[PDB]
Design a protein around this nucleic acid. Structure first.
Lengths: 117, 57, 122, 117, 206
RNA sequence: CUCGAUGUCGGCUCGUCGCAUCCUGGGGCUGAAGAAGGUCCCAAGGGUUGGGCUGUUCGCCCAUUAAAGCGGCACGCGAGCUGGGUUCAGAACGUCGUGAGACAGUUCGGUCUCUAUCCGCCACGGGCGCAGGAGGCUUGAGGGGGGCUCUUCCUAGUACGAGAGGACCGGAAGGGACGCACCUCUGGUUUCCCAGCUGUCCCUCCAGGGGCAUAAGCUGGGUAGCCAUGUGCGGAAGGGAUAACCGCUGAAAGCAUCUAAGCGGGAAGCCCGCCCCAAGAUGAGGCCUCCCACGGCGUCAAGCCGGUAAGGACCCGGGAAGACCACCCGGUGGAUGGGCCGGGGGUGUAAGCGCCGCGAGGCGUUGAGCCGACCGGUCCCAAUCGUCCGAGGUCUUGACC
C-alpha cells in the first residue's frame, strides 16, 4: 500500500498522462510551445527549439535543458506534465551514447563538434 | 596537563566503579538436552532444534 | 547565479560588456546580484571610444546560470551572466544590445524598453 | 547526515567484496562454514545472490558470477552440483546460525552458516 | 478543528494556472476513545485513535479502556482540549474542507550529535592560517571573573534529532474523501510514512 | 593580593549585561503649515551590512542602509584557535658611543604543550522515590524559543498651501536579514550503481572478466538517504495592567488645578495569546482500563514465597530513534529482517551469434544488459525452545456499606 499506492494515485488524479507525448529520445533537438504567458493573459504557444539534454522521472518529471544557440548559449529546462505545455514535437534524432547531461554540447560544443556527436 | 586535585576518597572512586557494577549471563535449558543455552544457540551436546549437526567426535 | 564582487557581462552601450558590481541594490543586506534584480558597479573591461567610460552605474539583472525558477514552473538557464546598465531612473543605457526574451525580465517589468529591445536569436 | 542507512558493512569496500567472495567460495566448498556474527549475516546476503545465479543457470549467468569468483572447479561445481538442488525454492538459500561460543582474546561471537538444506 | 494522522509522503502538484508542491496526509478516522467531560477533566476535550495494529497483540487494559464506550481494534492514540465531538467517530471525508488554512505538526526526524557545526548555525570556525582544528570547531564559553566561570545555556553539540515539533500556518489545498487523504503543501514536519497531526488556529488579522 | 608565577596587543569564534537609544516607537516643543528637520522625558524590543589601506581596535575612503550606537566582563575569551605584533641571540642601516654596546628609529626571519579530577554547561541513561500492583491519555503553576524592517504601492500630492512645498487615520504589495521544519521541485553528493579508458601481472591464447595502478587508478552521468544555492512557514492578532505625555469629576488654595479622593486616554515594552520543555513542581499526579485486594509466614505479617503474562523485563530480530543506553515495532497464530518477485529510478543497448569493411570497427537480435538504501507482494531463510521479576499499591482524616 502506502506511498507507492496512495500517492501514485493522487497524482494520476491531477497530471493524468502529462498528455501522452512519450517522445523522449536522448538526442533530438526538437521544438514546442508552452502556454508560458503574462501581460493580458498572453499565454503564448511559445515554441523553443532545443537540443535535448536531460530529465526528471516520476509524477513530476521534466524535459530538460535542451540547449539552444540563440546568439549566446541559452539552455531551456521544462517540467513534463506541467499543464504548462501544449505543442511538443520532435525534429531531431534520438541518437548518441553516454547518456544525458552530455552538456559536452553547451560547453565546448563548436557547431562542427556538435554535428560530430 | 590537567591532573585533578586529590581523589574525593575511595568514596568517589566507588561512586564511579559503583554505578559501574557487573551484571550476569542470560540462559535457559537446551531445547534438546539440558544445561544452559542462551537464546538462539546449540552446543557441545544437543546442538540443534532441527539437526544437531554438532557435537561428539 | 549571484555574486557580490563581480565580473559580469552586459552589452548595452557598454565600455565593455563587463563591469564589476559591488553588491545588490535591494534590502540592505545584499549577497545576491540575482536574476532580474538591480545593483551596483564600475567597469572592468575596456571601451573603444563610446561615451560610456570607466565609471560606475547601477542596473538590472539578466541571465545567471544556476536556476531561473519561475512562478509557472517555467524553467531555464543560459551559460551566460549579464544585465543591462542603467542611467538613474533605471532608464537603460544604450540604443540597443545583444540578447533576448523570457519572463523574468519583463516580469520584473520596469524596463519594457529592454523588453521589446532585445528580442531575436541571440 | 547519517542514520537512514542500507547495506551495512565494515573494513573497506575492496576488502569487503574481497571477503564476501573468498568466503562465498569456501562455503560453496563446504556447504557450511564458521565465522563471526555478521560475517555470516551479510555473507548470507551475498553468497546468497551468487547461488541465485547458480540457479539462473545459463551460459550468461555463469559468465557473470564467475566474473566474481574466478575458477571453474567451483564455477560448475555450484552451477550444476547444487544449483539444481536448489532451483525451485524462493531464495533465502542461506542458513545463518549462532554457535556456542566466542573466539578467544576477545569473545567475538561466532557461528556457522551454510546452504540451507 | 483538528485532524489525526499518519503522515504519508511529500510530492508536487499543480493548482490554478501554475504548479507548486504538496504533501500527503492520510487518516482513516479516529474516534471518541476517551472524553474529558470537563466535570471529568475540566480541561475538557477529545482523545482518539486512528487505525489498528494487530489484535492478537493487545494488553487487557487496552482491551477494556476501549470497552469504555467501546470502539475498535488499534493503537494509535492521543488527545486535544477545547474540541467538541459533534460525533462519536470522525474521518475528515469532510472533516477537513479544502481551500482553508491550517496549522499542523508532527514527530521531528532524528538528527545526530554535531556541534557548533550542526546543532546551531554558523558553520564552525575557519581554515588555513590555522589547521590545528582545520575549518570548524566549538566557539567560546565564558570567562575569568566575569561570571567567573563557564556559562549555562548557549547552544551545544550533539543529539539534536530525536525530538518533536510543529509548523504554523499551511494550506489545506485538497481533499480526497475516499482514501481518507489530503494534499496540503507542507513543511513535511518530521518524517513521512509516520506520525503527525493537524489543528487550526489563527485569528490572524493579516 | 601576585615575582614557587596572573599570557600583555590585533583578530578570530561563541558572546553576555548596560543605557547617558543609533534605527526603532510614545511622546509634549518649535523660530511646528506640509513634508522634512531640529529640542528634551519615557521605553532596550529586534535590529544595530560589504570592501579598501593600514598587524593597528581608531581612523580616513568606496557602495549602500531604516540604521549602519557608546560601553561594561583583566581593554571576555591559550586549558578555544590565531599569533603580523611590540619584547631573547641574528643581520640591516639610519643614530649615540673613544667602542665594547646601545635607540619606545626602523626594517627581514623569530621552536604557543595541553590524555578533564572537582563545581559549571550539553546530552543521554542507570536509582529510588511522589505508601495497592498495573497499560495508556492528559493539565499545566514554572521554565525555554521568536518578537526587525525596508521600499514601492493602495487613501497621495484635497492636510499646509498666495505660490515654490508636503498628509496624519489608515491601507496595501513584494523584498532583505533571520529562526523552524522539509525534498516534491531546483541543484550537491552517491568508495561500487551503471557506463567509457591507458598500463599491467593473472585466468585458460581470442574475445570475457580479474586484482594494481592513494583508504574507488581515470573519466561521465547517477537515485535513495543526508543536504543549499531549492520548498512550506514564522515574526499576528488580539486581551488586561502602564512609561513620558493627555484628560474627567473635585476640594484643601468660598475663582482656578488631572489631583491625595474616585474615573478614563496611552506606548513595537510588562502578564497572557504564539510554539518547546515540565510533579524528582516529594505540593497533584487528574482521567481512563485492569489483576486481584495475591499467597505464606510470631499482631504490629510496611518481611518471605507463588501469586496475575494484570504487566512487563530478559534474548532474538528489525528501526530516518540511535556513541553505549533508554525511545520504537515486531518474534513465526508473523511480514521483522535478509531472499526472492513484481515494480519505480538509475545506467546506456550487454554476453553471443548473426549480417558490410583487407582492417579499424559498423549494423542486427537491444533503448538490451545490470543494478544499494525507494512502493509494495510472497513464511524461500532466520525471528524455536525458554527465563525472571514483578498487588495484596504512603500517612491522615472524614463519609458511606
Amino acid at each position: 500500500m502506502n506511498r507507492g499506492a496512495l500517492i501514485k494515485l493522487v497524482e494520476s488524479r491531477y497530471v493524468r498522462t502529462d498528455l501522452p507525448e512519450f517522445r523522449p529520445g536522448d538526442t533530438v533537438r526538437v521544438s514546442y510551445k508552452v502556454k508560458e504567458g503574462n501581460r493580458t493573459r498572453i499565454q503564448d504557444f511559445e515554441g523553443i527549439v532545443i537540443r535535448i539534454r536531460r530529465n526528471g522521472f516520476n509524477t513530476t518529471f521534466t524535459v530538460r535543458k535542451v540547449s539552444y544557440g540563440v546568439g549566446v548559449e541559452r539552455i531551456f529546462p521544462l517540467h513534463s506534465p506541467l499543464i504548462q505545455k501544449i505543442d511538443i514535437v520532435q525534429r531531431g534524432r534520438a541518437r548518441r551514447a553516454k547518456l544525458y547531461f552530455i552538456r559536452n554540447l553547451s560547453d565546448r560544443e563548436i557547431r562542427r563538434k556538435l554535428r560530430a556527436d | 596537563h590537567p591532573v585533578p586535585k586529590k581523589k574525593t576518597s575511595k568514596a568517589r572512586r566507588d561512586a564511579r566503579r559503583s554505578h559501574h557494577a557487573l551484571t550476569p549471563p542470560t540462559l535457559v535449558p537446551c531445547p534438546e538436552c539440558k544445561a544452559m543455552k542462551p537464546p538462539h544457540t546449540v552446543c557441545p551436546e544437543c546442538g540443534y532444534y532441527a539437526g544437531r549437526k554438532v557435537l561428539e567426535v | 547565479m549571484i555574486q557580490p564582487q563581480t565580473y559580469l557581462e552586459v552589452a548595452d552601450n557598454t565600455g565593455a560588456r563587463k563591469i564589476m558590481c559591488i553588491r545588490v541594490l535591494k534590502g540592505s543586506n545584499a549577497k545576491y546580484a540575482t536574476v532580474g534584480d538591480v545593483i551596483v558597479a564600475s567597469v572592468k573591461e575596456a571601451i573603444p571610444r563610446g561615451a560610456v567610460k570607466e565609471g560606475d552605474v547601477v542596473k538590472a539583472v539578466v541571465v545567471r546560470t544556476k536556476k531561473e525558477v519561475k512562478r509557472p514552473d517555467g524553467s531555464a538557464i543560459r551559460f551566460d551572466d549579464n544585465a543591462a546598465v542603467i542611467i538613474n531612473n533605471q532608464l537603460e543605457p544604450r540604443g540597443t544590445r545583444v540578447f533576448g526574451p523570457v519572463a523574468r525580465e519583463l516580469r520584473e517589468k520596469g524596463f519594457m524598453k529592454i523588453v521589446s529591445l532585445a528580442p531575436e536569436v541571440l | 547526515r547519517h542514520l537512514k542507512s542500507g547495506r551495512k558493512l565494515n573494513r573497506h569496500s575492496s576488502h569487503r567484496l574481497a571477503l564476501y567472495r573468498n568466503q562465498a567460495k569456501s562455503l560453496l566448498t563446504h556447504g557450511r562454514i564458521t565465522t563471526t556474527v555478521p560475517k555470516a549475516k551479510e555473507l548470507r546476503g551475498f553468497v546468497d545472490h551468487l547461488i541465485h545465479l547458480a540457479k539462473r543457470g545459463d551460459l550468461h549467468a555463469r559468465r557473470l558470477v564467475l566474473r566474481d569468483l574466478q575458477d571453474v572447479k567451483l564455477v560448475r561445481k555450484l552451477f550444476d552440483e547444487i544449483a539444481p538442488r536448489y532451483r525451485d525454492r524462493q531464495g533465502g538459500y542461506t542458513r545463518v546460525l549462532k554457535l556456542a561460543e566466542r573466539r578467544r582474546g576477545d569473545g567475538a561471537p561466532l557461528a556457522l552458516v551454510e546452504l540451507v538444506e | 478543528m483538528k485532524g489525526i494522522l499518519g503522515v504519508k509522503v511529500g510530492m508536487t502538484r499543480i493548482f490554478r494556472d501554475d504548479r507548486a508542491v504538496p504533501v500527503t496526509v492520510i487518516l482513516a478516522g479516529p474516534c471518541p476513545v476517551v472524553q474529558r467531560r470537563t466535570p471529568e477533566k475540566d480541561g475538557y476535550t477529545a482523545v482518539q485513535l486512528g487505525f489498528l495494529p494487530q489484535n492478537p497483540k493487545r494488553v487487557n487494559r487496552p482491551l477494556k479502556g476501549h470497552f469504555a464506550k467501546a470502539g475498535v481494534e488499534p493503537v494509535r492514540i492521543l488527545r486535544e482540549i477545547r474540541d467538541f465531538n459533534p460525533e462519536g467517530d470522525t474521518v475528515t471525508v469532510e472533516i477537513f474542507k479544502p481551500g482553508e488554512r491550517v496549522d499542523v505538526t508532527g514527530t521531528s526526524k532524528g538528527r545526530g550529535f554535531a556541534g557548533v557545526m550542526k546543532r546551531w548555525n554558523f558553520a564552525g570556525g575557519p581554515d588555513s592560517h590555522g589547521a590545528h582544528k582545520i575549518h570548524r570547531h566549538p566557539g567560546s564559553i565564558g570567562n575569568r571573573k566575569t561570571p567567573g566561570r563557564v556559562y549555562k545555556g548557549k547552544k551545544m553539540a550533539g543529539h539534536y534529532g530525536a525530538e518533536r515539533v510543529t509548523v504554523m500556518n499551511l494550506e489545506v489545498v485538497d481533499v480526497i474523501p475516499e482514501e481518507n487523504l489530503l494534499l496540503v503543501k507542507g513543511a513535511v514536519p518530521g518524517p513521512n510514512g509516520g506520525l503527525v497531526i493537524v489543528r487550526e488556529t489563527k485569528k490572524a488579522a493579516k
